[PDB]
Amino acid sequence: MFEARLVQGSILKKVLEALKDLINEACWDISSSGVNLQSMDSSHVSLVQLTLRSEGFDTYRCDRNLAMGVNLTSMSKILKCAGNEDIITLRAEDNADTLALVFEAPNQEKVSDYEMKLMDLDVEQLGIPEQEYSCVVKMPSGEFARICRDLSHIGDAVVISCAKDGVKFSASGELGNGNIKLSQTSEEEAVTIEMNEPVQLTFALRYLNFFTKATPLSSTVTLSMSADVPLVVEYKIADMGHLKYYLAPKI
Amino acid sequence: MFEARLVQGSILKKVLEALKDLINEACWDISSSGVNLQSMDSSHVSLVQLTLRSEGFDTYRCDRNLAMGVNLTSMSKILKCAGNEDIITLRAEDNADTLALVFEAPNEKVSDYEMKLMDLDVEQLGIPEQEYSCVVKMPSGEFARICRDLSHIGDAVVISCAKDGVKFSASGELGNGNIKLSQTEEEAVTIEMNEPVQLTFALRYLNFFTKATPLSSTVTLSMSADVPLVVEYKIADMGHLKYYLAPKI
Amino acid sequence: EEAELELLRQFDLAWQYGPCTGITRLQRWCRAKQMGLEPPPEVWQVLKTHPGDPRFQCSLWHLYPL
Amino acid sequence: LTRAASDYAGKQAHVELAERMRKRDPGSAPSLGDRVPYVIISAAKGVAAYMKSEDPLFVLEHSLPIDTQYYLEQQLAKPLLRIFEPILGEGRAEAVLLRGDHTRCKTVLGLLAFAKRRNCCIGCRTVLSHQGAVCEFCQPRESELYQKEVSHLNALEERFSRLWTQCQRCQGSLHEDVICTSRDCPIFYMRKKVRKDLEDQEQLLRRFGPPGPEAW
Amino acid sequence: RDTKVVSMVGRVQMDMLQVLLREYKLRSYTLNAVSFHFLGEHSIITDLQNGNDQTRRRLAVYCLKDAYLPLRLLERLMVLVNAVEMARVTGVPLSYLLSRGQQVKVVSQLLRQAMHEGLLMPVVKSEGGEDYTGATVIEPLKGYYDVPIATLDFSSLYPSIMMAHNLCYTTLLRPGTAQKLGLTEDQFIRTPTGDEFVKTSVRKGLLPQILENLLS
DNA sequence: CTATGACCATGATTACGAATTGC
DNA sequence: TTAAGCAATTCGTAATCATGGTCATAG
Ligand SMILES: Cc1cn([C@H]2C[C@H](O)[C@@H](COP(=O)(O)OP(=O)(O)OP(=O)(O)O)O2)c(=O)[nH]c1=O
Ligand code: SF4
Ligand SMILES: [Zn+2]
């Protein structure tokens, strides 16, 4: 019998708002470690790993290793019917293939109790490698979204150069060439480019716009890259766990 | 000759944006008791009833009972050429089919428009007064969000008035949900009940009815057995505005 | 009943009481009695042991847009 | 109603009326090769003129309204613009669309059952409490407003009598009832509406009092 | 059209509905509508029959008037006299003019003209050739005219083309059989599509003679 | 709270397929 | 086994494009 609570519950609205434009479905793996989601993209370029530990929740009862599937955009349309101060509660029976959502109010006067049906899933599942990421950058999320959207009006795909002094976000386009340079700044607005060996890579800027949909989702964004590997953007879901978006690189 | 003058033109603009989507043509029954109107919608489903009493107009003058025929789209386009602080006067002859509107800014700028009326052959209907047995007084913002939020799921809604509170339920292909409300100044939800009610109404009409939300803070919903649900608003020392909608069988 | 509904249907088509498809049944019964043609005292005695039912107190074709 | 597959290929109005049976009779319906008659009623489904078609006898017995704008802009208007243009210019299109415009401004027409029978002034159309016909501002001109409309009752009375005695001569007999619901006769259903016109126009003049006593 | 038939040997059937539906193009094909167009005019019946005997007498007079109207239409419209003259001019029986089309009659007349010179007909069947080019229309000078225009036309155009240039099956010249004879002048002619056809000083066709009989 | 951008629909116009009539 | 032909005007119906209006998000 799964029954879980979340008081600062705006984060679920915030993650599924940054989930539904990417992918149409999700493989929700409920374990005693909490709520998890590994899922590929639809274009066979990217992946989402959501991890929600139990210690980031309030009140918890998990009796089953549930492995269910959610059609995301209808669930997001249901999640659009509750405010952000409102408490989010989930209830689930291991025989009744439905989700019972309970939206409590902070003043407790408006009660919501919605139900979404289940559909079967046989989703593919691959494991991420663990390795050394030659460049890990801590950045403000709003500035990062601002920069990549400022590059979106030049061209389509981005080339990155990650080195010691500055980092080089370059692009071409139908109006010519452009590039912006960044450096370390000597807690949320601090940046850090931790680097061992400088690299150059190609990535898709449109998938950076897709990844910056989680701009309000953390204190800071982390950008982890190495040679010829999936970029992992990290949004540390505060006190809860973390969301990591993998992007397999380009050739 | 008719001539009225009112200091708060904002009330006039809110009432004219209540109705420009549901109605295309109307007839104003100008009398020596005020400005009163009844109309049916274009779909022949719902009733509107609007009363602006004679006192609240701060300079009134009406010689003879008139009847003006107004295309509400052109009038709604004219009343958005007037800012939210102006003072509005209406000028009409008793021999003419053309109305004059003069907007007076509270500072050097005055504006005056003339609009051609039309003759129409409509029939005027009304309502009889009976005691609806479920009486709800609730905040208007919550009602707007409740209707708009249930709207994405399906198109009907069932209203379920019980003792401590009321409960709205709605279904659809992506599931179902209800919202409760309980007895506990204007953010309260006062609930008077003699007999419990459960009824079904379609959502497009309710999302039309919640277009006039800036007119007041609270909204009054009245229900009874098998009668058209009444949605009622009050305008401060001016009058009221009522919509009427019949239940499904 | 089901025998009283054929007596009235027989009173309604006898030509010696009048050409009656515009009026009620008891009005035609009293019209013939005034002129005293020969109304029978049984088509009266079923129009008294009933209330205002539209399948006793109405002509055969009181539908029918003629 | 021709061969059924060409009318399967694309949705028409008469095919939709024919294939929709009635509740009264699933044994008399149009077959292949005959002609289906219909009229177009008013509704709010503007994408489809095949959703507004009805049998003439069904709209007779069930009294559905008529789409006067459909008949105005789709049946009438374009043949007239074929004929009337070549004698003049394009000010002739504006002349007939302006002769419409002086004449388009005169129209006549669940919750619909709960009518309060709101009475109205005969002079200036102002709804008001009480049953008297005239308005308090338009009371002096009442002899002229009675004069007006009794010449309308007089012309409805003259039309009732010319029609309901024509059926007696087309039937043969003067002493027995008329039974002829012939759908191809203009006589039928033109004899039905004058009863209601007279029913309505007789009751509008009882707003005025009686012209004398009757129990003397 | 899809009809049932019932077998009667010796006797002949003439439903007047099928004769109207084949010859005439009208708006409604009801007995009332064609009786007005040419002359000038179920649940009630079940209680006119369960009643008295003067009601049944009224029902019988109605039925006899119904059974009398098609006789009047048959003798007034000159149906049967024209059917007898059609069967005498074409040579087909009297039951074929209610069941068949216009092929059996031209087959019949061509066979009756073919026994007099000793020819046999072949069987060619093909599915299927292409279309050819039909008739010309001249481009108008559109408008309104108020000065008189006079109309001149040709009478019996295509049968007289087929008559006066000696065109037939039995005189169509194949492209090779003119060669290697070289006599072009007054032995054959040439058409705008391109064929060659023999002059009348060698052969007479069969379709000129059938057409000449029909024209007289 | 206001302004700008995006989406969504709705309406109008143009192009094609089909009952009837002219030949 | 059984069946004249073709040219169309013309209007209706369907699809596509354009234009604005409304709602939501960001500053
Ligand atoms: C009406 C008709 C005409 N046509 C062709 C043949 C005709 O020679 C040509 C002229 O049409 P018509 O003028 O209609 O007929 P017609 O000229 O042969 O006889 P008349 O002048 O006495 O009325 O059109 C047909 O092929 N089939 C038809 O049904
Ligand atoms: S309705 Fe027409 S057809 Fe019928 S009896 Fe009267 S006049 Fe004759
Ligand atoms: Zn008046």
Side-chain angles (χ1 to χ4, degrees), chain A residues 1-106 109-251, chain B residues 1-106 108-249, chain C, chain D residues 1-115 119-125 128 130-133 135 138-216, chain E:
Chain A
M1 314 185 161
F2 181 53
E3 192 161 357
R5 186 181 170 86
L6 179 53
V7 181
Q8 180 71 27
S10 66
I11 41 188
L12 180 46
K13 284 190 54 181
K14 274 146 201 185
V15 297
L16 187 51
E17 274 296 329
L19 257 169
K20 55 160 152 187
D21 62 339
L22 328 170
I23 50 173
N24 204 47
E25 76 95 35
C27 170
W28 288 70
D29 299 291
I30 297 182
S31 43
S32 276
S33 170
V35 165
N36 200 274
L37 168 51
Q38 59 271 18
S39 180
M40 264 302 166
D41 71 314
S42 301
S43 184
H44 194 75
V45 206
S46 190
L47 205 162
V48 43
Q49 176 259 1
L50 174 85
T51 186
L52 263 50
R53 298 153 214 167
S54 45
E55 49 263 19
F57 285 120
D58 206 305
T59 310
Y60 196 67
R61 174 149 184 246
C62 195
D63 292 328
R64 180 65 181 89
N65 206 269
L66 271 182
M68 301 170 307
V70 164
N71 217 357
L72 296 176
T73 190
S74 158
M75 185 38 79
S76 87
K77 288 189 81 178
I78 292 153
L79 288 202
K80 274 178 174 178
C81 319
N84 299 269
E85 289 82 342
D86 310 348
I87 299 99
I88 290 193
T89 312
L90 201 150
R91 291 175 308 174
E93 289 82 352
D94 309 319
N95 53 4
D97 289 330
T98 184
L99 317 177
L101 301 91
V102 194
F103 297 130
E104 292 85 1
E109 177 59 45
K110 165 155 183 164
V111 175
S112 296
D113 41 356
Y114 300 120
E115 288 88 27
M116 186 159 140
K117 303 326 157 205
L118 259 287
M119 69 302 297
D120 198 6
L121 73 161
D122 203 358
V123 187
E124 72 281 349
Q125 208 155 284
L126 309 165
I128 204 60
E130 273 308 320
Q131 49 168 351
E132 200 281 302
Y133 289 106
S134 309
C135 35
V136 284
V137 180
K138 195 166 85 58
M139 193 67 219
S141 297
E143 194 59 62
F144 176 50
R146 163 73 190 273
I147 287 306
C148 57
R149 200 174 31 85
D150 276 334
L151 269 296
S152 279
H153 304 84
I154 296 149
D156 187 280
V158 68
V159 51
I160 193 174
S161 172
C162 313
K164 272 310 193 296
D165 305 70
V167 69
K168 273 77 52 173
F169 307 146
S170 198
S172 83
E174 54 276 359
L175 55 92
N177 285 321
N179 38 6
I180 316 174
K181 331 290 170 299
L182 273 300
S183 63
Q184 311 99 4
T185 313
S186 87
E187 80 300 334
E188 194 207 39
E189 272 306 305
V191 308
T192 293
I193 308 108
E194 201 270 311
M195 178 81 47
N196 43 66
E197 191 267 332
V199 289
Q200 54 277 355
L201 282 87
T202 174
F203 282 106
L205 179 63
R206 180 80 265 195
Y207 299 154
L208 313 182
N209 310 347
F210 271 14
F211 277 9
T212 47
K213 293 273 164 290
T215 301
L217 264 298
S218 188
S219 71
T220 75
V221 62
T222 319
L223 276 292
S224 71
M225 274 159 290
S226 179
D228 206 348
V229 285
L231 155 68
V232 195
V233 315
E234 287 87 4
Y235 303 94
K236 271 285 170 172
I237 314 193
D239 192 74
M240 172 75 83
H242 54 257
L243 168 134
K244 285 190 285 215
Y245 284 160
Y246 315 117
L247 173 61
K250 313 306 210 72
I251 202 66
Chain B
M1 173 167 284
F2 179 72
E3 176 142 352
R5 184 193 187 121
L6 168 67
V7 305
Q8 292 175 356
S10 51
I11 299 185
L12 210 74
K13 304 162 71 162
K14 294 180 220 155
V15 184
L16 214 58
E17 277 277 9
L19 310 165
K20 72 155 192 165
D21 54 321
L22 192 63
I23 303 167
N24 204 1
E25 300 287 321
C27 289
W28 300 88
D29 174 60
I30 305 295
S31 60
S32 171
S33 159
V35 188
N36 196 355
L37 194 142
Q38 296 91 19
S39 181
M40 294 194 73
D41 58 316
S42 309
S43 298
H44 275 189
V45 192
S46 40
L47 213 70
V48 306
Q49 201 274 329
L50 160 72
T51 303
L52 311 166
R53 304 161 176 197
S54 51
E55 295 92 5
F57 272 94
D58 311 309
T59 297
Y60 200 90
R61 191 185 157 276
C62 164
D63 188 88
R64 178 222 305 168
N65 285 179
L66 257 171
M68 281 189 285
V70 166
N71 167 44
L72 279 181
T73 298
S74 284
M75 198 187 198
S76 293
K77 278 193 64 185
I78 287 174
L79 276 183
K80 300 308 181 297
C81 290
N84 267 18
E85 279 316 295
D86 290 4
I87 302 165
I88 301 193
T89 186
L90 306 154
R91 182 133 70 203
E93 305 285 335
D94 277 328
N95 73 323
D97 59 343
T98 300
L99 186 64
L101 274 74
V102 178
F103 311 123
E104 314 175 353
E108 62 264 8
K109 193 194 159 199
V110 70
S111 67
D112 40 354
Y113 300 98
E114 311 294 321
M115 173 183 36
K116 318 155 185 169
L117 314 172
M118 303 184 162
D119 43 350
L120 324 174
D121 291 88
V122 310
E123 180 52 283
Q124 295 179 356
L125 277 79
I127 217 67
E129 315 301 314
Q130 56 191 347
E131 316 308 307
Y132 319 112
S133 190
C134 275
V135 178
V136 191
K137 186 193 61 60
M138 76 155 65
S140 42
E142 306 277 343
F143 192 69
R145 305 292 85 71
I146 276 160
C147 280
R148 190 161 82 107
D149 279 346
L150 299 171
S151 70
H152 332 117
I153 314 299
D155 58 74
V157 163
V158 50
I159 318 297
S160 303
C161 203
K163 177 64 188 68
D164 63 323
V166 199
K167 187 178 79 71
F168 310 133
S169 311
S171 90
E173 66 86 18
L174 69 161
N176 53 4
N178 82 15
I179 292 95
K180 284 173 186 179
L181 219 49
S182 82
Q183 266 198 355
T184 56
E185 147 74 16
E186 63 197 350
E187 67 271 42
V189 185
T190 314
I191 299 143
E192 271 292 326
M193 164 190 148
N194 292 347
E195 53 93 25
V197 166
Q198 214 193 28
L199 270 190
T200 68
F201 316 108
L203 271 160
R204 176 48 53 230
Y205 305 139
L206 311 159
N207 296 332
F208 276 154
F209 298 162
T210 63
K211 280 275 176 192
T213 323
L215 268 173
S216 304
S217 163
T218 200
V219 286
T220 307
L221 296 165
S222 293
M223 298 193 291
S224 174
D226 70 51
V227 301
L229 167 67
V230 194
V231 196
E232 195 184 21
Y233 305 181
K234 309 290 182 180
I235 320 171
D237 286 34
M238 271 278 262
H240 62 244
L241 177 49
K242 303 205 208 81
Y243 301 86
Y244 284 93
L245 187 64
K248 290 167 165 177
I249 322 182
Chain C
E1 192 178 3
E2 294 180 351
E4 286 170 84
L5 263 296
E6 198 69 28
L7 261 291
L8 307 178
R9 205 170 313 123
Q10 282 273 307
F11 171 75
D12 284 358
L13 279 168
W15 86 107
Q16 71 259 47
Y17 301 144
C20 309
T21 77
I23 61 186
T24 322
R25 168 162 298 158
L26 194 142
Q27 282 171 313
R28 162 200 162 115
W29 196 90
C30 293
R31 176 175 76 175
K33 184 66 183 201
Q34 195 262 9
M35 300 177 297
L37 294 160
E38 231 3 298
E42 188 71 29
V43 194
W44 190 72
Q45 271 288 87
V46 311
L47 299 179
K48 191 165 153 273
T49 59
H50 287 128
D53 203 314
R55 72 167 183 200
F56 289 92
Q57 270 83 14
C58 269
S59 174
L60 267 191
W61 310 324
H62 74 112
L63 277 81
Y64 295 100
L66 59 93
Chain D
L1 178 59
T2 61
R3 71 277 190 191
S6 44
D7 306 338
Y8 284 157
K11 294 191 74 64
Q12 313 270 311
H14 54 284
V15 191
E16 190 74 29
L17 175 70
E19 302 301 274
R20 185 195 320 122
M21 297 307 167
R22 291 291 88 195
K23 307 304 138 197
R24 30 144 291 171
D25 198 350
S28 72
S31 279
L32 194 151
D34 50 67
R35 283 196 166 261
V36 190
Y38 64 101
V39 294
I40 289 297
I41 69 186
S42 180
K45 211 281 192 193
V47 197
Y50 55 87
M51 291 295 182
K52 300 141 68 193
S53 83
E54 195 48 85
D55 192 52
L57 212 64
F58 204 77
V59 63
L60 191 140
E61 319 283 359
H62 282 209
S63 315
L64 323 170
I66 310 299
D67 196 356
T68 43
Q69 211 56 52
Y70 175 74
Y71 283 101
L72 182 47
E73 76 196 34
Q74 280 173 261
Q75 312 289 124
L76 280 179
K78 33 183 71 74
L80 291 179
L81 302 169
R82 294 183 181 277
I83 295 174
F84 269 114
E85 287 193 25
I87 302 174
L88 297 91
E90 273 291 328
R92 197 56 169 115
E94 301 305 284
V96 192
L97 293 176
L98 193 74
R99 294 183 181 277
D101 275 330
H102 309 322
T103 56
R104 277 147 185 147
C105 316
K106 333 180 184 170
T107 81
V108 174
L109 292 195
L111 187 75
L112 284 157
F114 285 151
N119 290 114
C120 287
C121 180
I122 296 184
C124 64
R125 302 157 154 157
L128 93 144
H130 95 182
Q131 312 248 337
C135 168
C138 43
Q139 292 177 335
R141 183 202 14 149
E142 191 205 5
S143 177
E144 196 176 358
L145 287 183
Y146 185 86
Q147 244 160 279
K148 263 33 120 151
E149 85 195 3
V150 77
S151 177
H152 184 62
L153 176 78
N154 190 82
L156 262 48
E157 296 261 21
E158 194 274 356
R159 188 202 320 170
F160 186 88
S161 278
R162 282 195 88 199
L163 292 169
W164 267 97
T165 196
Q166 160 67 67
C167 279
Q168 272 184 335
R169 282 170 273 149
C170 166
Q171 175 212 45
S173 177
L174 299 183
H175 299 252
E176 287 176 344
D177 307 305
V178 185
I179 310 159
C180 165
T181 70
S182 160
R183 277 88 63 208
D184 288 79
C185 199
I187 284 302
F188 180 76
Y189 56 66
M190 189 169 172
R191 60 159 155 92
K192 193 187 189 57
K193 65 191 173 63
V194 194
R195 270 189 184 177
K196 294 302 137 282
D197 283 329
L198 210 48
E199 176 69 30
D200 68 46
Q201 185 65 216
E202 191 260 4
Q203 286 266 15
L204 193 150
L205 285 146
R206 303 219 288 103
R207 245 122 109 53
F208 292 89
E214 57 92 20
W216 47 278
Chain E
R1 283 173 196 92
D2 182 59
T3 310
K4 311 142 94 165
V5 298
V6 174
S7 64
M8 297 293 177
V9 291
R11 318 204 198 275
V12 192
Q13 299 200 35
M14 292 203 60
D15 204 311
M16 278 296 303
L17 192 150
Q18 295 297 111
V19 187
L20 289 189
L21 261 60
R22 283 171 55 245
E23 207 282 334
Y24 284 99
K25 291 194 304 176
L26 312 166
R27 210 169 170 111
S28 160
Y29 284 105
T30 321
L31 188 45
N32 312 110
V34 293
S35 90
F36 186 77
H37 175 56
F38 289 114
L39 313 185
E41 172 187 356
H42 277 165
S43 67
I44 294 169
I45 294 175
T46 313
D47 278 343
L48 280 173
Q49 205 272 337
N50 278 282
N52 291 325
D53 52 356
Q54 263 86 23
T55 47
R56 298 195 271 262
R57 190 194 158 274
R58 188 186 186 178
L59 183 59
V61 177
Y62 180 66
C63 192
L64 266 162
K65 175 57 190 151
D66 269 355
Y68 187 47
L69 190 46
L71 277 172
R72 294 178 63 190
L73 261 185
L74 156 70
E75 56 168 340
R76 200 187 283 245
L77 266 162
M78 284 175 56
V79 176
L80 206 170
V81 176
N82 293 346
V84 170
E85 185 204 316
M86 209 70 228
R88 289 186 189 180
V89 172
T90 56
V92 300
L94 207 59
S95 43
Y96 281 8
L97 302 185
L98 278 150
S99 297
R100 301 261 190 153
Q102 325 275 317
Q103 273 176 2
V104 283
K105 310 157 54 194
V106 63
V107 169
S108 179
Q109 298 167 348
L110 179 79
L111 277 186
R112 291 172 185 272
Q113 295 281 344
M115 193 161 270
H116 303 159
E117 304 201 29
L119 318 163
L120 274 158
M121 77 168 190
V123 188
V124 300
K125 187 69 200 63
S126 43
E127 297 222 339
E130 62 165 320
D131 201 1
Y132 65 111
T133 302
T136 193
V137 190
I138 307 175
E139 275 294 316
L141 311 191
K142 183 195 167 303
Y144 171 91
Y145 280 81
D146 212 352
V147 50
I149 295 101
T151 304
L152 319 176
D153 62 351
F154 298 100
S155 62
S156 310
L157 188 58
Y158 285 176
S160 306
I161 290 169
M162 293 210 58
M163 275 197 223
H165 276 287
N166 197 22
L167 269 60
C168 175
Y169 287 115
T170 317
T171 181
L172 166 62
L173 199 75
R174 91 173 175 91
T177 193
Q179 280 80 53
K180 282 319 190 323
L181 192 64
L183 281 187
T184 60
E185 54 276 0
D186 74 278
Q187 270 98 26
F188 58 86
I189 66 150
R190 284 178 174 88
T191 70
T193 304
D195 304 309
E196 320 96 320
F197 271 76
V198 179
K199 280 277 207 168
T200 189
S201 158
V202 174
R203 295 290 291 270
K204 174 79 74 70
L206 309 193
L207 311 178
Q209 312 203 72
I210 308 172
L211 278 178
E212 203 152 322
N213 165 49
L214 273 164
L215 180 135
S216 182

